[PDB]
């Protein structure tokens, strides 16, 4: 089996990649587990927006790091190598865990 972890910032582009790899391993391999969604990391930030002196004047930003977990139960040979050779857009970081 292959655990696949997708880390991204845009959830539409990660759901685009997860459904892409599902239809891929659905055609080639067998028993795609599911696009199980994980909790989203929210790395917040808070900065002073004034150059010199305003302690109360601030912006509060964040970065939402969207996680997706997709498992492949029976890896064929073309399932593994042809899906590893298949690549997705940037912003998505894929991370395979074979077994």
């Amino acid at each position: 089996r292959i655990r696949i972890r997708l880390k991204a910032f845009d959830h539409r582009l990660i759901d685009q990649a997860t459904a892409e790899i599902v239809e891929t391993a659905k055609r080639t391999g067998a028993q795609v587990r599911g696009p199980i969604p994980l909790p989203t990391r929210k790395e917040r930030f808070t900065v002073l927006i004034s150059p010199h002196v305003n302690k109360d004047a601030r912006d509060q930003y964040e970065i939402r790091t969207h996680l997706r977990l997709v498992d492949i139960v029976e890896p064929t040979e073309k399932t593994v190598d042809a899906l590893m050779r298949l690549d997705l857009a940037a912003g998505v970081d894929v991370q395979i865990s074979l077994g």
């Binding site: 808070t46 109360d56 601030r58 509060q60």
Partner: protein, 127 residues
């Protein structure tokens, strides 16, 4: 034959399962007197089953997570009302009047910038 309801509160989440029986209350594999060391929470978890007269009528299996003592008691009441309306549905006309079916949406307010709390401003001085 068990009848289910989810109750929620500040940050609590109760899972109530109703079976007909004698009135045995089990919360997280514990008795109500063991679990809530508080008579106000012992009242609010018995309030709808004394609104109707069904304390002795039915047994119940309860799990609850998150929150505190009054939070878990509020979600247990809201789960019990959700499940008694699943049991009968003729009781919604009374539990609405009792204010029980309404989920209390009073979350805590976030701390804001400049303010030491949600609304407390720091101490002011002209000079």
């Amino acid at each position: 034959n068990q009848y289910y309801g989810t109750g929620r509160r500040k940050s609590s989440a109760a899972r109530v399962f109703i079976k007909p029986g004698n009135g045995k209350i089990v919360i997280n594999q514990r008795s109500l007197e063991q679990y809530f060391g508080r008579e106000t929470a012992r009242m609010v978890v018995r309030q709808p089953l004394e609104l109707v007269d069904m304390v002795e009528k039915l047994d119940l299996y309860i799990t609850v997570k998150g929150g505190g003592i009054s939070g878990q008691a509020g979600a247990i009441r809201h789960g019990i009302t959700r499940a008694l309306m699943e049991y009968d549905e003729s009781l919604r006309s009374e539990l609405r009047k009792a204010g029980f079916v309404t989920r209390d949406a009073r979350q805590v307010e976030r701390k804001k910038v400049g303010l030491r709390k949600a609304r407390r401003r720091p101490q002011f001085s002209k000079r």
